[PDB]
Amino acid sequence: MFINRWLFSTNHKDIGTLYLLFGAWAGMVGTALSLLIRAELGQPGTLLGDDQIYNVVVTAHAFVMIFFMVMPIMIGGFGNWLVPLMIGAPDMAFPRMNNMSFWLLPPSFLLLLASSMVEAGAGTGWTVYPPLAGNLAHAGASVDLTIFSLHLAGVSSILGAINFITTIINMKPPAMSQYQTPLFVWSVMITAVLLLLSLPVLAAGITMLLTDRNLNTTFFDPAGGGDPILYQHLFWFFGHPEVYILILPGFGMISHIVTYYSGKKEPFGYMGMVWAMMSIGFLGFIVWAHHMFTVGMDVDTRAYFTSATMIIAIPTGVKVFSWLATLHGGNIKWSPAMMWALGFIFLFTVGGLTGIVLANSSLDIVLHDTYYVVAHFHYVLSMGAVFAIMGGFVHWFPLFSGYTLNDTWAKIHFAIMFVGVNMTFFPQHFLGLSGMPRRYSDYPDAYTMWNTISSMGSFISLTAVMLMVFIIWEAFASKREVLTVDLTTTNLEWLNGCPPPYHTFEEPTYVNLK
Amino acid sequence: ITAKPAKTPTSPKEQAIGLSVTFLSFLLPAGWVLYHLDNYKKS
Amino acid sequence: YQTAPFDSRFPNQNQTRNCWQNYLDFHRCEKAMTAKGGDVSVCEWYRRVYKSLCPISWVSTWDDRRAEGTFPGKI
Amino acid sequence: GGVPTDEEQATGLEREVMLAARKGQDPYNILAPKATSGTKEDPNLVPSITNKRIVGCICEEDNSTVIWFWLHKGEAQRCPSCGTHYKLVPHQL
Amino acid sequence: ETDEEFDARWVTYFNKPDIDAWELRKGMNTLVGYDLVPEPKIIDAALRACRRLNDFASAVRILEVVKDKAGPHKEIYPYVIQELRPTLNELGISTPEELGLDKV
Amino acid sequence: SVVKSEDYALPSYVDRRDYPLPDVAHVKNLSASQKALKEKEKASWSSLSIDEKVELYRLKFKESFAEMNRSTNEWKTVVGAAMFFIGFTALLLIWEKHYVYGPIPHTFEEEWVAKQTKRMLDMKVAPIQGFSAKWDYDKNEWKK
Amino acid sequence: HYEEGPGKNIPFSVENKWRLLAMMTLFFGSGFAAPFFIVRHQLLKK
Amino acid sequence: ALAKPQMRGLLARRLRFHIVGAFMVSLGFATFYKFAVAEKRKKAYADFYRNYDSMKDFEEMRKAGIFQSAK
Amino acid sequence: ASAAKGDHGGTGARTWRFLTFGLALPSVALCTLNSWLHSGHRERPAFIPYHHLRIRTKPFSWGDGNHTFFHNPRVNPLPTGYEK
Amino acid sequence: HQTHAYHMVNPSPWPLTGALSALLMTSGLTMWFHFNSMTLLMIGLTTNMLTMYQWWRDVIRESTFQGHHTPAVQKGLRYGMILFIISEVLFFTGFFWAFYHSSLAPTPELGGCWPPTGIHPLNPLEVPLLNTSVLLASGVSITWAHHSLMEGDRKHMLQALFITITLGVYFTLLQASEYYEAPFTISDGVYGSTFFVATGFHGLHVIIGSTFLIVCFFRQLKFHFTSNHHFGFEAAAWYWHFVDVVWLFLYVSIYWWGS
Amino acid sequence: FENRVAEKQKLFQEDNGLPVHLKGGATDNILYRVTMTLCLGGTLYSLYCLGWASFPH
Amino acid sequence: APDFHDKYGNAVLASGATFCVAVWVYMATQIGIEWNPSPVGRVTPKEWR
Amino acid sequence: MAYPMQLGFQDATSPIMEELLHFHDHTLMIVFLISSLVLYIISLMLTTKLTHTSTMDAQEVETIWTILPAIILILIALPSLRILYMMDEINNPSLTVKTMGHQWYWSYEYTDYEDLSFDSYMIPTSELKPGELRLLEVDNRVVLPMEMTIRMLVSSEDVLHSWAVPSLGLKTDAIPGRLNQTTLMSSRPGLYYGQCSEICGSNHSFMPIVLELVPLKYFEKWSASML
Ligand SMILES: CCCCCCCCCCCCCCCCCC(=O)OCC(COC(=O)CCCCCCCCCCCCCCCCC)OC(=O)CCCCCCCCCCCCCCCCC
Ligand code: HEA
Ligand code: HEA
Ligand SMILES: CCCCC/C=C\C/C=C/C/C=C/C/C=C\CCCC(=O)O[C@H](COC(=O)CCCCCCCCCCCCCCCCC)COP(=O)(O)OCCN
Ligand SMILES: CCCCCCCCCCO[C@@H]1OC(CO)[C@@H](O[C@H]2O[C@H](CO)[C@@H](O)[C@H](O)[C@@H]2O)[C@@H](O)[C@H]1O
Ligand code: CUA
Ligand SMILES: [O-][O-]
Ligand SMILES: [Cu+2]
Ligand SMILES: [Mg+2]
Ligand code: NA
Ligand SMILES: [Zn+2]
DSSP states (O other), X not given: OHHHHHTSOOOHHHHHHHHHHHHHHHHHHHHHHHHHHHHHHXXXXXXXXXXXXXXXXXXXXXXXXXXXXXXXXXXIIIIHHHHHHHTTOSSOSSTTHHHHHHHTHHHHHHHHHHHXXXXXXXXXXXXXXXXXXXXTTTOSSHHHHHHHHXXXXXXXXXXXXXXXXXXXXXXXXXXXXXXXXXXXXHHHHHXXXXXXXXXXXXXXXXXXXXXXXXXXXXXXOGGGTOOHHHHHHHHHHHHHHHHHHHHHHHHHHHHHHHHHHTTOSSOTTHHHHHHHHHHHHHHTTSOGGGGOTTSOOOHHHHHHHHHHHHTTHHHHHHXXXXXXXXXXXXXXXXXXXXXXXXXXXXXXXXXXXXXXHHTOHHHHHHHTTBHHHHHHHHHHIIIIIHHHHHHHHHHHHHHHHSBXXXXXXXXXXXXXXXXXXXXXXXXXXXXXXXXXXXXXXXXXXXXXXXXXXXXXXXXXXXXXXXXXXXXXXXXXXXXXXXXXXSOGGGOGGGTTOSSOOSSOOSSOOEEOOO | OOXXXXXXXXXXXXXXXXXXXXXXHHHHHHHHHHHTHHHHHTO | OOSOOOOTTSOSSBOHHHHHHHHHHHHHHHHHHHHTTOOGGGGXXXXXXXXXXXXXXHHHHHXXXXXXXXXXXXX | OBOOOHHHHOOHHXXXXXXXHXXXXXXXXXXXXXXXXXXXXXXEEEEESSSEEEEEEXXXXXXXXXXXXXXXXXXXXXXXXXXXXXXXXXXXX | OOHHHHHHHXXXXXXXXXXXXXXXXXXXXXXXXXXBOOOHHHHHHHHHHHHHTTOHHHHHHHHHHHHHHTTTOTTHHHHHXXXXXXXXXXXXXXXXXXXXXXXX | OOOOGGGTTSOOOOOOTTOOXXXXXXXXXXXXXXXXXXXXXXXXXXXXXHHHHHHHHHHHOSSOHHHHTOOOSHHHHHXXXXXHHHHHHHHHHHHIIIIIOOOOOGGGSHHHHHHHHXXXXXXXXXXXXXXXXXXETTTTEEOO | OOOOSTTXXXXXXXXXXXXXXXXXXXXXXXXXXHHHXXXXXXXXXX | OOOOXXXXXXXXXXXXXXXXXXXXXXXXXXXXXXXXXXXXXXXXXXXXXXXXXXXHHHHHHHHHTOOXXXX | OXXXXXXXXXXOHHHHHHHIIIIIHHHHHHHHHXXXXXXXXXXXXXXXXXXXXXXXXXXXXXXXXXXXXXXXXXXXXXXXXXXX | OOOSOOOXXXXXXXXXXXXXXXXXXXXXXXXXXXXXXXXXXXXXHHHHHHHHHHHHHHHHIIIIITOXXXXXXXXXXXXXHHHHHHHHHHHHHHHHHHHHHHHHSOOGGGTSSSSOTTOOOOOTTSHHHHHHHHHHHHHHHHXXXXXXXXXXXXXXXXXXXXXXXXXXXXXXXXXXXXXXXXXXXXXXXXXXXXXXXXHHHHHHHHHHHHHHHHHHHHHHHTTOOOSSOOHHHXXXXXXXXXXXXXXXXXXXXXXXXXX | OOXXXXXXXXXXXXXXXXXXXXTTOHHHHHHHHHHHHHHHHHHHHHHHHHHHHTSOO | OOOHHHHHHHHHXXXXXXXXXXXXXXXXXXXXXXXXXXXXXXXXXXXXX | OOOTTOOSOOOOOSHHHHHHHHHHHHHHHHHHHHHHHHHHHHHHHHSOOOOOOSOOOOXXXXXXXXXXXXXXXXXXXXXXXXXXXHHHXXXXXXXXXXXXXXXXXXXXXXXXXXXEEEEEOBOOGGGOOTTOOTTTOBSSOEEEETTSOEEEEEEESSSXXXXXXXXXXXXXXXXXXXXXXXXXXXXXXXXXXXXOOSOOSTTGGGOEXXXXXXXXXXXXXXXXXXX
């Protein structure tokens, strides 16, 4: 019974729950890796050992947070629970293949942990650039186990994306056009089209790195006529779309949360929100070499990547303002979920705005490979993707479990986290402008004050993480069972009750074509 | 949202135990490694 | 002669072909002067330019390979 | 010849859907129902195999918001946004 | 449409003799969606409709929601009540204040 | 009064400022006297007492607007407790500085810093605005 | 067919809050502790 | 008797009033920032270099002993 | 274009088989004839130990580590030159 | 009891076996590359082939034998396959990108020219042209197969499909011989690297598409396909055209223009 | 060959509660057990190999 | 009836704040942390050559 | 170099770095305005009991909040791209210096006239002389002539590194098999510091760059004496 249910699943809700659990466990590993980082940097000198060990920690930190935390929660977790409910579908199109998406992640995680246990770890950066990631400067199994980890995570997400796109286009009620699906479902679809197009290119480029390391090819080795910078283009041609992948389901959830705790039946400017997500999607595939502005590219190439990168502010600004216009006139409910979404709106906008500073190739010469970048991307990831995750979690926890959280504790958790992440990352802008490089285990003495504070903020985030776990315990311990939820008329995923039965929409909804 | 009163109420004292055991499950193993770091570094 | 001047044929940040081409030119020119019993000293400009531009390990490697018979450019 | 037809070999639900479609019937809800005028005298009739079915009401053509509510066996109910009328008609398949 | 046509639609809406309990609720719940406090004459037609539906409590609730829609504009509700007073008197509708239902 | 989990599909009661007339009465079963009161409501409301008018309001609705919209002292608990765990976090950083971190580099000793500061002034670090700009090279002191 | 309802649509039990506390401690704590122990592994190697 | 107050478009009126406030504040901030940061900067550089004497700056550094190449 | 043939009334099985036997497979027999003719061993070129060829940064995981997976002794020299 | 037309699939162990088999094959290639052993790899290849066989066996059970593939289920399969092929196109794209990057700007290490000094390419008018005519021909014979099947003609369906498979097999043998004969190898700098990797992934896709056509040949022998319902055959036909288009881009890029 | 689809349809529709992966009969159970045994045994072996490769030799 | 916040609110707040301010003041000034503030206006430059 | 508690860029030491400071000031003013406008509108939306919960019309307001941002972007791009093309202009250098990244040091090669080359390694902390900067000093500095246009060429002989000097606005990646060019002009004499800016293994943190900028005649004599 157990093994049939949880190892052999063909049910979108139980597979969605497994992804949530997996992603929460990855969050704790990611959080530990991040405290090791800030502990090394929390005073001048050397805490752990030289740059090799420090950057094995740094690399795993990124891979765990992006691949094992954010994507599985947002897409495997929320996406599988919610998308079939929100379109009145009985399950995903390929419910059995959906379960292999899930079961590829624990082995992909094992290969990542193996890579760090053997030899001296892969201390390469999560971008795995050669030649440092090559078989001379990283001899032995760690980079290969890393590559293989990524292959499996890749296959997992490409089969997920085919499942989501198919299910969203093919399994809506016959009367429902694509422009009558909720924005979260739109964000999963766009997201999946991006996974589909971008992961095969990373798979090609990490395959060439594997053959360069193990079969005597020279795609990236100038001695055989190859080029290390080709690898960067391949990687980035995936890596920019990847960060739009990490954010877009967060934008979808935000729009549902803001709408719901403003007392609104619908988000402001629906079609503009759609158009914005599709534009950001598309634009996200033509801008990748803004990660290469110091490699030595011609000037016109740099002019074009600066401008194509900037233009993304326009559709992204449409979203920000439509979220404000959704709040406008609302009957505002100050839930813990709403607080995470309001923080999202403001702190994403700040990190999106320092993205725009970085889009300027002239100034990026001096910001590139410094903590300015690090401050940028943690605003959008630690206070953007993560805030959406948390707002989605506290919002839909009662739906998934049938139990309520304590709102007061969840408010306290938000407040602690808000202070902890800002204290962590805000001073890193100063570190970046004043010239502190990335991927350093130690720093010239002048950079001490900000690194000390940043490390202290990281501890405040730790306490927020440990508190979250006690909060989830408390909910399950106390068993306050949900009774009534408002606004079901425009929130279909709640209408089968909490938690919904294993099988829902065995009889589809009735929707007239008129 | 409305809900029923807790089926198995968790009192202040029970919350203090839950919270304490939760903080310690993260603090102790990591504190143990960090405190012995010098012993590792010369070994 | 101070250093190699700006060459409109290699206007960009990647100067790798500037170095290579002047290295080739110098050695083609020596070969041709030494065929036709001439003065190699007409070739000296390309030697100054490739010397200014080229990393020492690259000239040294290319010198070894021309001596070995394994230099891949055409001279 | 030698290749079976769907008439000869289609089975299970595939067959049920194909035979019902020949009779002009839609027991597996493949088509979208056409609206009546939606008044109390002429309510949309909602088949169901139980005593409640969730309805999604697109109140005006091209609305992007769908309004969702359980339809229960009994007197007709009205969409809470546009007041169009629906009435369940249970049992069978 | 003009302000006057808007108000007249609503008046006529609540003045329907055989208005049912669903239409009462639907009209009130729709109307408080708008960026306005309803004119006295619309509230008057909704309060007379509560009377034909034998629903004293919804009449008190309508008064509460007038006051609520005014937000921080504290002059609006005492004015509307002043204007409804003959109607309140005629139907025996006690205000929320007269019922103690404005206390927390 | 008593709401049941297995009722989720049925219209339910809610107190919301923006949905003043909910889909069902808060109280649907009536006592003998509550029944007599609903009959009485069919006659002139001027003949109802204040108490009766209240009792009808409380059958139809659970909380009044002033009840449902009331503010609470929750913020004091959220702000106090947040400061408490933030305060707790400092204990962790005290333990870390005592048991984890060793001595920092000799370059932060007071005499090292004094010489390094002189040398930064001798090399004119940031002489336009950031650093040396704040030293008075004539009066041989920090600009006041 | 499977149990349904609060507490039953999950791979872990919530029948007893204290056993639940143990299980959640092991699960989250093992996540958190692993990088510390891998760091230790690596130091104690070379 | 109480006079009739405005009762319509209260949310829109409040919105209009404050968006214009926000615009006004924003011009006022641009003004302050170009004074306190931008012109301050341009003037510090302009004033620094106006009569800057590089050889003298060098000689001071040389006398201070900072250089490997110049005693 | 249109190529230079005709049918297009119906694309049925008869037409596609007509194309399989009257165009496609004769093209294959033509190319197979052309090839089984230009086949015959081309004279292996002198060995020159170019440093951009015969790359070895890690031994291959089969054989003696020094031989490619489809090593042909006639035509693939090792880094030290052609085999005995 | 459902009244929609979608397929609720019985709980299945093949996802977990396929996952583990991915773990065993990648762990296995590690052990092979770094620890001189092929055991894990062989075990992973084995459980992978068992997983594929049983999973697709079961899809056949569900459709031909149980009738779960209503039109809606079928339409979903069509989207799925079209999406899969899209993602396979992007994968080749990264390898084409590598090819043109190297070949449009040959570095001094190659002689500053393409093909590099010391590289003697195959003649595109020889076996590579043969390979072309073979894959183009097999696209014509598979379309004959598809029309026969729609036309209800069992025997000409099997003859045209057999011919399509024998042509895939001929391509594969020709290509294996060409690999043996080639005077350049995978270790011959970026020229060998891009050649063998791009054409070798294509060869892998030809083998996989041939195996899919063989699965269809035996299903057809066993009368699974009706004249209207035969998605397995369509999918493999689309995969096959994909494999042919890929080869035409390799031929034009690497063999012709890159020679 | 003869068309025996009808027979397989009757076999795979038998109301016996079996999952499709085991509905073919006793051979399905054998192939299942062989598959799952190779996967779980191979997985414990890959862990052992990790333990081994985790230390210098 | 008074909830948790009416009864304990003022105390949680007073004592959370007192405790936070205390322990951070202690951590910041009493345990040997080197903040590395600017020498400007606080360090007297000393001959190094 | 950076000094304690620094907030912004190191003071500019070349005209182009000065230009980057003004363009950053201009862009950050926009950054601060937009984010404070957002924070402000946020507080405005949340601080009223007045409601308007019915469908709102969106084609009108979307024009503003599409066109304004386009305009602001153009106001960023214009000075951005002016600076870009300035950094690319032909300039006629008097001197070419090559630097090669290695694990974990730089070597410099000054070969327009003689074969001058040497290696440049961080001073270990326990060997710093009083007043010297932890992690930033090298045994052999990159001596260069002040007020002259210098062509720096940057490559690597092993893994990636990247050659940076924040004061002058310079950061050029060091890729093996490739020769990247940048131009370096100091307005002033003195010591200017940078650090390797691409991850390159165990001692990435510890292979810094110190330029020493002096009069031509002092540079010439140092060159001679370095042979
Ligand atoms: C945490 C440690 C802070 C240490 C503070 C500096 C010490 C001063 C020494 C003593 C002062 C010495 C005087 C010398 C001035 C030299 C300035 C310079 O050379 O040039 C440039 C400097 C100038 O920087 C600054 O002038 C400080 C800017 C402060 C912005 C507001 C945030 C402050 C809020 C609360 C505390 C911070 C944490 C919250 C973070 C919230 C995230 C935005 O460098 C920066 O670029 C950093 C900013 C990065 C870009 C992100 C901007 C978007 C921010 C959001 C606006 C929020 C809206 C209202 C703001 C909302 C508040 C109601
Ligand atoms: C999603 C992406 C993500 C997130 C959230 C974080 C969070 C943090 N990271 Fe970051 N980081 C990266 C991605 C992320 N990081 C990347 C890509 C890099 C660069 C890698 C490279 O250079 O190669 C990096 C690099 C990086 C560095 C620079 C290292 C260097 O250059 O030397 C630093 C240093 O301070 C840092 C610190 C932190 C800290 C203190 C946090 C903290 O804010 C974390 C606090 C904890 C949480 C936010 C927990 C989150 C969620 C859960 C616990 C799940 C809860 C589960 C459910 C509710 C179901 N990171
Ligand atoms: C969820 C993750 C996420 C997201 C959404 C983004 C979004 C953006 N990123 Fe980010 N980026 C990262 C994650 C993210 N990024 C990571 C991880 C890295 C480092 C990778 C590595 O090296 O490891 C990085 C690095 C990175 C770089 C390279 C810097 C360098 O290495 O030197 C650049 C450069 O252009 C950049 C730009 C942008 C831009 C313009 C956006 C835009 O999409 C942001 C757009 C949003 C706004 C502009 C705010 C909203 C708009 C308004 C309120 C309207 C009005 C605004 C204006 C008119 C300007 N990013
Ligand atoms: C008719 C063509 C058929 C192709 C199949 C041939 C047999 C080998 C099996 C591998 C198939 C995979 C294809 C691509 C992998 C890389 C190289 C393959 C192309 C090939 O076979 O090239 C041979 C080299 O093989 C070598 O190195 C051998 C390498 C064999 C080890 C395979 C490498 C394993 C690593 C691949 C991991 C793949 C990761 C992909 C993930 C995909 C996305 C998830 C060329 O022979 P040579 O002697 O060098 O030159 C000829 C001299 N007369
Ligand atoms: C990056 C996140 C880390 C967060 C910081 C963690 C803070 C709290 C750490 C508490 O953990 C411990 O405290 C010790 C001391 O306080 C240790 O005991 C050691 O110290 C002793 C006191 O010297 C002895 O009694 C013991 O034998 C012992 O080994 C140690 O075992 C450990 O579990
Ligand atoms: Cu050299 Cu980093
Ligand atoms: O990637 O931003
Ligand atoms: Cu990007
Ligand atoms: Mg870089
Ligand atoms: Na450190
Ligand atoms: Zn409707």
